[model samples]
Target chain A: RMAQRAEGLATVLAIGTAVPANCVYQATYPDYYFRVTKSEHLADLKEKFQRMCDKSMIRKRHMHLTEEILIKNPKICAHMETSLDARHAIALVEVPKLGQGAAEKAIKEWGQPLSKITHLVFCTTSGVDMPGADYQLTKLLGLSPTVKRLMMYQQGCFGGATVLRLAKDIAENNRGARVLVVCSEITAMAFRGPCKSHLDSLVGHALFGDGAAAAIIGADPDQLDEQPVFQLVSASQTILPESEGAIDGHLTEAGLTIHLLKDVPGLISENIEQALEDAFEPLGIHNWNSIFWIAHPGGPAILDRVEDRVGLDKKRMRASREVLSEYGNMSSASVLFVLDVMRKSSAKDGLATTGEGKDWGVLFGFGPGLTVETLVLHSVPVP
Target chain B: RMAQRAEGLATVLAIGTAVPANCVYQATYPDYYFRVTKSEHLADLKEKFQRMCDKSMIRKRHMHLTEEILIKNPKICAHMETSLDARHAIALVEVPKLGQGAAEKAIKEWGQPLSKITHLVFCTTSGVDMPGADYQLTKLLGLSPTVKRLMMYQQGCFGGATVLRLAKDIAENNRGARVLVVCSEITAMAFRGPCKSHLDSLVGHALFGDGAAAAIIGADPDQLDEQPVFQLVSASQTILPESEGAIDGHLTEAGLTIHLLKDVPGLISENIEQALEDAFEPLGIHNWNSIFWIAHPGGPAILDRVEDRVGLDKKRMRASREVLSEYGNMSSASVLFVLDVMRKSSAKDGLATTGEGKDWGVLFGFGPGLTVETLVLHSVPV
Candidate 1:
């Protein structure tokens, strides 16, 4: 028989992040053809598209170019850009070489050693392989071979929130265990296919980019008492029944592909109110305005629907919109970008609410199963 | 700072698995029109193809019958007697709803309560999704919401062995934790699409079929006292340098596709001997004949290479070949199928042997990094 018990855990440290490149979604694509074809529904699509585009400050997107481009440029096809493959190959080589590069970067930035990290948890929906990113990273970074690693994938837009909750659970259960949480996405690689037909496909194509982020979740309550961006207060998940058809993925001769439903807005609209109520009630937080909302920007329509349903102060979503407008939708890494923006501004304004144990941040992500993953974070200070 | 110390944790109690009803392979396809064309020069493609068919015993491979058969059905396309998407969906609905299926089956056979299971670890490579097979199984089995759960995917053929190692660790570190290690692979589902012009692609298609198997890993050692079919002794992973091109995968518009290297046998031939020595030396077992080998049957050539390098007795690999013939190559679950066959036979023999309580079973899998993952299992009496 198995025994069960609760162990106290804390999120003693964290690292916020953002990418180095920018993308312009509206201007990069050929608009003349779109203008010619959509002449009839131009007004409607234009209005919806404009409203969607206006939701985020992400104007430009970035990516590593590959030899496959030669299919479009025959001349370059023969020369083959080694760097594009190199970049991807490097990520494959570097990301898993966690003993160095990003893992080392995270450890050095967090001022910790390899031995201090007991649990390594990473999140991504972009690139994946076995002996996964965590496995590769641990070996490369020279962390403890026995330092348990967990790799969570395919969560997409909601990955950051999901991973943080997972990290919190790991830290809480294994006292003295310091958890490393990493979120990385190479959205640009996913957007390589030609954007023809399918409005939902184009929307996905026009609105996402690539990037990586990492944070440390430790068990020092004294550090937690110092400066906390958001105290990880509680977490809950709701998997809507009979929702398999909503999102589909299959491997074909070409590659792995995602079948995204255009009606995603409708799904989110239906669940936002209930999800919000369920997430907040446990914390006894009644007023929506009192809670800072850090939502995953699935797309422009998703943001508008969330804003409409939650009825929060429009300004609270400003950071989210700015991130979208600046970097498009970065999959798992977008939320961390927004959080980084908030953290920087708070630092500038001398906002000591979290360090004093007063401020709160609520984060969430939605993915397959029509699943909603939620987390309430309370920020404290580092010792 | 994190504190590091070893703690004697609980043990895995039970395991359960699910496999498809039908199995088939290469030789069954017609010669002139449907014969798999080869790309690599390792051997006579036709001869190797026939040998695999003759030895595999697979008659008619599974095809995705639910979907209308397209005229241009490639050999890889023919292998899909069913869709993995459909299998996963059914498993999602059935495994969880029928809590008594495999996990419960093992528990009942072992005479344990459903409530005794405290953790569920689900592993698969045939298909991918979220709230995955793990969530569905837990909810269906009526496992506690508080029960810790983990879902692992894309580890490829050696995936089951990896999860078994993990389950053993969880049982060792977490107090009183009963880990239910479940592996389900719907190989037929992955067989969509024609083989690429690449030689490795054709071979990968010619081999592999659908199946799933689940076994309870941890039963009380003090109470049962029957030798455990295998005890996990050690696991080691080695990543070959600059060999990323050896195996590759990508998400295409249709689904996720995995690419296998034709030179996989050569890759294994180069590495298996050293890997075996590294895994076995610590246990003081120098002779390969002393232990059974549970290898992932990536294909016939790969299996032969492993045998050549490790010097495993052909008789010992019979169960593995039988499973291949009966079920094609079940990817991640293939090795476990061999282990299961050995366990059933040992149970029949009544007296299982181990030199100094050191009966050994070796498990391993290879994937994208051109990497090899191996584990040593020490069989102890229940």
Candidate 2:
């Protein structure tokens, strides 16, 4: 009976993140976006978009849909119809390729043979297809075909935290299981020309970007080359009450349609304290500042709300804010980008702990269903 | 250190199956389908479809889409365009309700409160939406908001075996964790008029049905009311080599488009022996007749191939054949229906084990990727 169980808790062994080559500066995005889609005539809406970008807190974003591709697929810029097939076609090729970029680096950091990957947990909001990205990634990376795999689709922002939680259970359950977790996102699915009636689309356009992040997670990291970055202590997912329509999204004839309500930040503000109280109170950690934060950079408003409402120090939120400013919001991929930054920069700054000298931290992902996924993490003090 | 692990193997506690009210008789299905979709004009194609239905072992199937629904949405019968949004809209509501119907029965059978369900694993190829059917089922069933949930989409026929494997690991990993696994499917997504250019669609039309099956699975069934039906011993998933496109499907503007190549059964016939050898060889079980079989009834041909290749007694394949005859193929839900029949009938037949009175059995799910999911099950001698 005990043969199936692993001896130790699952830990993050390595982290890697990747972005597409095409960069669009947030300062001039509105002008570029309006020009490419031939929506320059919507001058009033263009200025409003520019204002939203100015206040977005994101500096630049890398996109897979460059001007050339956008120009080639003019139908995508117009409406929802006649676009999903073409958009998904691009995603079919790019999602796995982007994930491969990150996984390669993660594998290098892991310093182990690729054959050791026993399981794969892939999450994405960008693509929907049969023999999904998980299957494609297996072939791309030449991992074992028999590798136990799980694919997550249409999971919004919180997908990053969700996959990590899944990997924890899988690794802890199976002996010698080394699970590779990847979250890849491309905005091509929801890209659309400015519509005066649908201002909600603007928030997604101004904020969302294309990127992928990969991590190798496993238990019993006793090998000479193996290293533990953080121990995954506990995980939980909760849906805020009465927030059903707050972060609504669905796939349509056009592609992915996302609507972010204004109440999202306020909702988190109201419920966050109790949510964390339930999480940290059990550990007897009352002072929120003592723990590092790896929050999904949903938007400037959300980060501000979490920081203010959680009563966290400004330094605790720097990793999330920095990722947002540098790469915009990559949805499920953003939290890992924040995590990569945290582990590397913490040591560079001569902090006492890998979590900027803090021994413990919390990783948060907020997405649709107005859901909040929290993982209590213990930082492994290492350079 | 071992606080999170359960000591005993995960076992199926109860099973429940549910179907919609609209039953379509296979005998007159060709005429009704052609008439409803306004495809009677294609006489030759209609004749071919009739022949396909005749060859199909299915006698009847339940569908969520009724005559009234088909007539109301004429665009759904015409072309792929303007149909998916409507099809998915219907699926969003029906999928969860059908699943809830089955889950309620399983919960009642388990003699557990709604709050006792610690995790929800909902799978389907029917619906594609955010805050998916998994979320909706939680609300509809009044399951605790904190009930950990996992939703699977576009996992074809083999999804039944896949979810059982997942539940096994989840229950074994977390102490006291009880997993509620539900698979629901609706043909509304792929409901279209017969196209002469696409005969593959007809196979799905004749064979596929709408239904849901729920199972309550957990470890350490020590309670007075709890009973173990089958011990989930081990599980494995293998993708057939060079069979990437053998069984392919993708969601399109037409809803869900599935294509099954002719080579599927032959491929499985050649590779299944090796797959099973790898699975059972470690356990010193070389004789094929020693165990019962719970194979996914993909179609008659696939079932015939497994029976012939494995050289099994005809009775070994009876449960799968009986399910296919009655419910057609309910994708991921069919295998559980077969399991349900296996456990209940063994005692009725005065067999030695719950697995048709056999000590061990193999459950199989064949789907896209020419994927085969195998679960090595040990029947508790209850």
Candidate 3:
């Protein structure tokens, strides 16, 4: 048997983020859709949709197309191919492109040859191609052919941390292994509509955005030339019993549908405190006062519920708020985007970690399984 | 840093496999297609497709539907949704059902409970549903909610062994973690083509059937009261450079289209030896004589090419050929089906071994990266 790993080991070298070219600010969408459809028939639906968008807390998002263009002529050929086929086509074209942007940024910033990376864990839920993003990205990134790979698909928002959990094993199990974790989701709004009175789809249209994020993980924090961003101390995962039906995201003939059945925030809020306790108590972290929370922006309501139910201060989740207003929920890539902002935080903003456990940020995410995945991360400051 | 594992180490307790309800014999497809397509329009294509089916060594296969029912009526809506989405809906309904059948049987046969499984790794390319099969199956099977799950997507054919490699890591990296790996694929031929002269798809139509398989693995092989299945020794992987364009399984407006270039078997023939050397030499595996090959039978041509090039006996790949003849290639589920055949092989037929050095099985798989994945395995005699 291999030796036991450091109790809570794994270090982050750098984090990279990216978004698509088309940025749709909130207000213009109703106009865009109005123009695209070229029909007076959609005026009521447009008005209703715009009302929800106003309440979504999001300012804008970058996606493959705008509502006008899609209303004019959107391309999600649900009949010619299978949903699998459509998703695969998008995956083949987008996963590598989206992921390579973030991956290359990290590789160049770290000044490491692509071949130096020994493991690649690619995550996605929006779409996937044959050979997958992991196998496809290797060819695109010029990584070594022998590099180990794990392609995580359909895990939802928690995918980023789940990949990190896998990276923990690869980094620990293999000597000097530098693992790259890349997450990208492309849930374009154009194809997501036409659901009648479905809350999850309605909320999703107003919230989720297209984005990609990447990070480097190593077993030993000291091995990196650049100062480590965060030390991944320990990670935990648990599913709220009988909660599967609450957060279900389904692949429908129309596109991906989130069955956000009003009961979700209750399930998450009810279970999060106990889950946090189980996740943090082993690390001698007795309370939330000492920890900062950077959770997946499931929505403004879930965020507020986490604060009230888990007894966390709203200030602790500020980074998450900044992410919501700017980019909406970018699925698995959202949490890392929030983490990257904090990494670049200036002291004047009162965000630089004092590192006296104040540097501790607990990363949490919720997704399909009514599952919550948590990681206890600590900031490392170096001159 | 953690110490090196004994190179390649993982143990299998039991394996269970399942196929879809509809069975179509090779000879029946043309008649079904002719009737359902409602056209003598494809007569020439049918003759050509049937000729290759004859050459394919596939007698029958299990699938989601019949061509008569399909070209008659296909389910997937391509645009607003994708072939993937449609397939996913089916996958949502079917994969868990098929996987649970194998899973229930394995848990009972292996004397393990659903709650004891700490990790669930599921793979599929035929279709993927929302929340994934991992999340759905846990709910359906009443498994412990705490299970760490990984649902593998888009990684084709080799996904079986690819997941086996993953199972090795999960079992070894997490102390006492019991890992369950499930693989399934579907081909609802009705969802495919009426496109004239699309041979890549024609061959696909002649091949691929719906099937699912599952396995239980843990760090310690000796802990099982029952005899072990395969002790995964070492697993290795590599992509054939410049060969990416050769095996293209891309999504089209119609469905998943596979373009299997004529050059693939040659790619395998050329690079497989070096790949095998790198994979096995570390385990002191000098040649094929001392090992049994549990290979992913991509097709008869690839299998023939592998045997001719690797200097392996045809008998060494009997299980593989049997799987090819009986089930066609079930994508990721196919190779494990072959391995299961060997695992269940009757001694009178010389398929099953007594494990006196004869139990060592070298696992091999080929797929999408024009990739090669190899595993060293030891079959333990009870």
Candidate 4:
């Protein structure tokens, strides 16, 4: 009887997102192969580079600028600087401050005061310290001390998606609850110098950029109407065992270090297809073209594998590629950046309208455990 | 109007805790603090060391066996050997094998199979990685893909308390929904050679041990034979600004390094009293004797300050000092360990029974921010 009742209820309401400063892909990476200066074993650097590049089809990827860039562009940098500062600050400052700053900024930008907040969820892997982001953000944002806060940490790229899934559950259970989801990552702080045997470790230096993103989810139909780009419909997560090494951070005498397993590309190819199939099965969607795909661009190779395994056309993944090329991988916020791009582009010509008067899109990210998090969203009238 | 509504609601749950392997305090300290070989700093160390021992009156502390200790103990040495070999074998020969070995072990111990767990909150600071403890535990535990898992890392001493607060909120609003809080800290992996400047880091080494704890919140009320021992009544957190240099972690060429600020003791003293005042004000409770205090034993000095400032009677802080003496500080799991002790001890004598047959306690932990997390709980028949 309980099972029957549970089966009768499953739904999602709204989806909102924020991204880091705009970055141009071409300006970040000049000679891609040159970044790997320590690879003495490769006899022909050009050939090896060509083969690798061909496998991923990444012409250029986004890279985070040094502190110098922020100092040079103080005006534009001030707004986006919070995103970057919060991420880097995770390793040095307490997490609550970084998280609270971002959440406050997000609440203000969303034009909602702290008192309106109902639930606060903080997601991060860059660093974890208490009072965690949720608590700090609650205080900083002046949300009710009773406001529920969930801190989701160490889930890697899938951190953001998992938070959304949790938020969806919160919103579904409590009508009119406003949920704020914050994802912060300081991938650069995890970077250690290259090692001869650990090629995957070096890839992170070029692939990951520091950033934080905040999104507000609520049941308010009126607020949803103001920016009706997408409605969070369904969310699911799949964890493949024995993939702990694929993505992990470790403590050393020096600091926190990230370890990336090269087999991630292969893992994505093998598991993403099945995970997506299972995630979409309940939605009764068979064709891929009907929905747009927003996937975590886990560097060039993993993105290609996702596209191929999911059978998504190149055009369908333009926003994802653009995000990767421009901002590199902002950890959990990367997909949100892509979603923002898709939303802006979709609204430009009203491509968001569907037969049911709403557009549908799927957002997904892969993290450690070789875990895949997938969420399906629909664009409909807010009310 | 909204503020008034929130004020009326009470935190209806108390705490869930996980403890690492228990050890005798004094018997383990010589070995735990074995890295301290230099006599040059002995005079300075004695004053600091004596204060810790005398003030907290802790006779021993729990510690995860360092590489040096393991090398000398045959039984522990064997476990280390096997575990290392297993790690290697799993990574190499049995990479494709799923839901067996470590993953399976984690599941068997922590997974809530058959429960409708809508959210999975995984916490750890001692180790790093993606397919971290959460993913493996879920798969081994056979959780449905529909279960959303979120990992909390680098939260150190207060990780468990923070995660539990998160779980309490989810269960409250998501009616009938269950959330699992898992905490695992393996302090042995980050052990460093001794140095004078690194004395603060050694405090964790001397105190902390490895262990995993999992708790399920949100079972049906009817099935609960008694009221929960501790109801989460209220929680408050405060972050001290401009104190980043006090604590931090940085990535070096070798690996990830952790930093502990010397001023942490001062920070605790400065903020703890105010944080507690804020947490307790809403409850309309003024007396400290009415509440049981479960504090994160962040070494002896911090605990002493918390005791002094909060005016907690010496007897009330016994569980905290016991856990610290027996297990140093197990990072996130320390407070839980203390809470467990309090629960069992309280049950033995039935000391906390109220007029309506309810028991109440207050739990708190501090970490970087030098932040303080305080939660009020009411214990009922379990």
Candidate 5:
């Protein structure tokens, strides 16, 4: 019965992250954003947005919608009106191109022929277009047309986890199959001129950024030079009870609208213990400190709560905090950025294992449905 | 290495289909559509539509958009304008409910506890909704909160085959996992008043319908009474070269805009044989007649081309034609409707297998990218 499955475990072969050239320093973002959108008259909102940005813990964030692009699309900066056509148009071109940058890096690091990629799993916040970003990436990367493709749209923040889980199954089920998993997020869909009445959009404008991340996942290392980074052991998803309304996103005519409730941190604090326990109890692991963590840096508060709940020290979550600081919340692409940082030689020098030397690790992706996706990862130990 | 996989093959345990109550007979559709959209003034276009309907081969199509609803929402009937918000609101409610109807039937037929379903894979042409139609179905079906889900949006016509392929991998990869695969499509998103300049939509209006189909797929059927219908042997997807523009669907400010070029049938005809050969040559199967076929009933022309290209006899494709006749092209839901019809005892009588008594079968879904998803199915011989 077991022989029916692939011979080796699914491993993360290589990881890469990319962001656009338009870097907006967090301290100056409010000024830049309001000025570009010509909302300088809204002094109170601008002041509030500045306060949020100051405390956002983000040093800088990259965005695809440059000043030139935002100014030309007046409707995109309109207070509350339809801008989907303009936003989708930009996303259709930029999302895949950004993903191509990240994918190229991962493919280069993997040291394998791109032709070996038999599956493409792409998740993005900017969606609803056919011959989707997945197809566009295939064209951009010149991937074989026969590569089985799964394009996920508007998956919110947890999409990185979702794609990794999907890639794990695909790689493990098909022998010698290499799955290219990409999470590309562009904030163009959610960008808008700040509205005084809708303060939630202000928080989003302060936090979200454009970024793309890619990873090569495969099972059975057939080549002598191939080295596994992180073995994807098992995965699980739990929708926190009654948390459905906590993180809501709607694809309105105006573009993607997000309602991230203020109570999200509280909900996470309430549900984290049980969700983590349920995930690990099956594996007979109870000590939280024994395993490393890769938490989606949804925000400072989200990271803080997971740390306090898991009783992790400051050093343990440095990778997540640093990614958040460097690139704000990149939606689905954030976790992969953190993972890429965690595995770097400089980052791993003082650590026991790439997972801070912990053989076992847990990856977290929190998104809509207050959905929490947890993947148990086994770090490849260094000699 | 072999011991790493689940013991048994993924099998189609049960199938169910549902459609809205508003049934429009093909003979009366042109009159009804024209009357409802207040396009009575366009006599020439109406006459053209009627001619197309006369030869459409579709007997009737069920729709969720009733006359009352269309009358209430004038924007939906407007030509070349944004109606996405309005259309999405309706689809968000109806798509899941319709899927629930089909899922309930499949669940009852499976005779298993709903809790046994560990994964939900929902596909639809309705693109770009978060907490999408998949989550809606999960709630409506009262599926386990932990039921892992993969919601696919804007998958075009081949969504049914796509979801089945996903379910196959999920079921085989996870031990004892029962996947509820649902493909629900409502034409509410595509419904619009006719414009003389844009005749492509007329074909959509003439052929498309609202329907939802559900199937229970699982590996290692543990229950003693559980009977496997079709064993999912292998799956493959091939994108026809340079055919990307042939079948394009865009989610513009206006509801989904599909440009299914007239060349689609010709493209399929040109590529179907080679695609089929590539799929079967690996399995050492060369004879087309040796297997049953479940081709997506995209339209009469598509079915005709597929039949002609593969040299398949008319009776061999009866399942697809009957589905097209009864339900029109229900987008992603059409294939499951055919599969359901193929397995009925009455339909199986006098046939070699449930797959017309054929042990081997091929299922195809052609949609955007000119992408063709082919799944080789093995009928569990009686």
Candidate 6:
């Protein structure tokens, strides 16, 4: 039998993360939540939230919030009026600018000229604007006029992985091609309906943050030396059964609002094992002993559920926890930060292989449509 | 040299289009517009609008609307109220349901089960819902739970081809994979801001419509001993010089609003040559005779600008003109309808090819940022 070769995997070349200075640390969320909602949380719920925040492995989250006193304290945001034009421009000016920081950093790190970029893919869920943020990034980054752009919008947390999967596909299709994937969200811009159900709205306020992350994926992770980078093994996506109603996001007066229907984690738990079964068994690996996981840090329990299902040690998921601790869930860009942390951790320890020989990596992201996205990565170095 | 095979190309398997039954025909648009705006169009403007409509070749357009009737025609739209909830549901309920019509038809035409689909790319500027129209499509079409979806929103009229180009790239990337591109719009959902300038708004009312178009493109049309198909050659995109401000769209109290600077046609005309030149020259084709054009019928003037620049005769653009005539401009889905018409025309006239020869086909769509999207195609048998 022919040995499996890393011909088609998209190699992660470099990743850049961007966040605003307006951080509301997890410890301060209770006061912050009260200020915005004008209601204090019940003790048990507050206790539950506190424990979750503690276990979330999260410390601070960035924000450019419209509420109040954003920059000075970063925690106490009083309700402020959000104007129509400003609201519209949030997707235009703010989201792209946040994304621009990451783009500049990624391009700088890659040490490649803007002209080398062959394809551009951007994903966002926080805002929607025409002449999208992707278009604006071109002018900001000085990308070539003829370069192709594929924009993905409203895919939510899983979108970052979505861009990664497609980048691999594009890089594989066009050899010697360099592709950039930008994922940014200004979840702070969303101000939920005062009259709408507050359970989901409360979840939004407690969870989302503002940040951006961009990366360059190549046909050869070892693009420069044709060495092993992070070889993309395979990607699989599955929707939970009878769980189309699991995650509901409605279009209201305040942009798009989301809700994790009462039993989100449970529904996913019921279906996730089967989703991974087909993908895992084919690789001749039935357990998590040899795999590195970059699970999306949606929240604490989500991480717990994933950890339990995969039977992975906490040391293996330290990078993900550290990122969450450093910068809360950055919406779609959360996983990129996780992947970046993994890359950094590996470099710090010392590099060896990037394939199935010794260690493998798996990336998983969950989002609306109750979708679970999983991708495998190899750590075996090319000989 | 080893023979260059169909390694990078994605074959066009089938296309399906869907539109609502509610129509605002060209003959009645004046009354409809005048009624909605509550303003009478003076002679010169009315005459210009009428002439454009007459020459647009578009006789009707689909709409999901309820409103006041024109003073002259009190019989139409007596007293229907369009509320915020209903408007919001337009994307969730209306847009997806309409798109499903086309989805079913395209899947049926391909004679393939939805389970085989590997990717779903949906583009729309019409309406945006959180659990978007793409999610609704999977449920409606009975697709497998695992079909990956890539949603493209707010891509204006150029989006249909946007989805098409991405579909091609995806198909080439994953050989033997089938990709579905759904471009749908409910332009009727957009109502103008009472205070904003209405020049572009008036143009929108005269031009845009509601419709959906879907196509299945695969890794190899040559996969089996299949019939002839439109094998993609190459696609090119360009942003006209200093023309980014030519078209503007703003989000207002009223949904998405559009604006067209007076000189759009001219700016596009000035820079369109260099775009097609780079793409056309590499293919060894010098003129329009060898390539069929599927220009987005943004309006009559945009089409006129393209016709003059490409030096193409009217007969060549009949597919585009006929689609515009029958359905006005269906936002991003408009160009797909033209491509569909081209395929149907070939079948109607008998098919040795999908277009001009062993030669080519060219597609152009213009949208906000004054974006001019162009794609080159090879007309050959599988």
> How do all models score by TM-score?
0.69, 0.98, 0.90, 0.73, 0.97, 0.90
Sorted into a CAPRI-style docking class, model 3 comes out as acceptable
What fnat does each of the candidate structures reach?
0.15, 0.64, 0.57, 0.40, 0.74, 0.56
Q: Could you tell me the C-alpha RMSD of candidate 3 in Å?
A: 3.8
DockQ of each: 0.17, 0.72, 0.43, 0.25, 0.68, 0.46
Tens digits of lDDT, candidate 1, B263-288: 76788767888888877886677887
lDDT minimum window of 10 residues, candidate 6 chain A: A73-82
Candidate 2 global CA lDDT score: 0.88
lDDT, candidate 3, equals 0.72
lDDT of 3 by residue, B1-382 (tens): 2332222356788888888778878777766655554544667877887787888988888877644444434434111123444444455677778888777766776786677788888887766555777876777778788788888866788888888888886777666678888886767412454446567766776778888888898866545364467787667778887787677665443446677888888898788788778877766677776777788888888889888998986677788889988899888888788878876763445544523237566777788877888777777653
Per residue, candidate 2 scores C-alpha lDDT tens digits across A269-370 of 788787778779889998889899999999999989988988887998999999999999999899999999999898888877778888888998898877
**1 or 4: which has the higher TM-score?**
4
- Supply the TM-score of chain A against the true chain A for every candidate structure: 0.79, 0.98, 0.89, 0.76, 0.96, 0.86
True contacts kept of 4: 0.40
| TM match of model 5 to true structure | 0.97
Ranking by lDDT: 2, 5, 3, 6, 1, 4
After best superposition, candidate 4 residue B97: deviation in angstroms? 18
Docking class of 1: incorrect
True contact recovery of candidate 2: 0.64
Q: Tens-digit lDDT track for model 5 on A316-377?
A: 78889999999999999999998888888434486656787888888999988878888989
Q: Give lDDT: candidate 4, residue B83.
A: 32
Candidate 3 lDDT score at position B165 = 84
lDDT (Cα, 0-100) at A227 in candidate 2 = 89
Ranking by DockQ: 2, 5, 6, 3, 4, 1
User: Which residue pairs come into collision in candidate 2?
Assistant: A80-A254, A353-A357, B353-B357
Model 6 RMSD, rounded to 1 decimal? 4.7
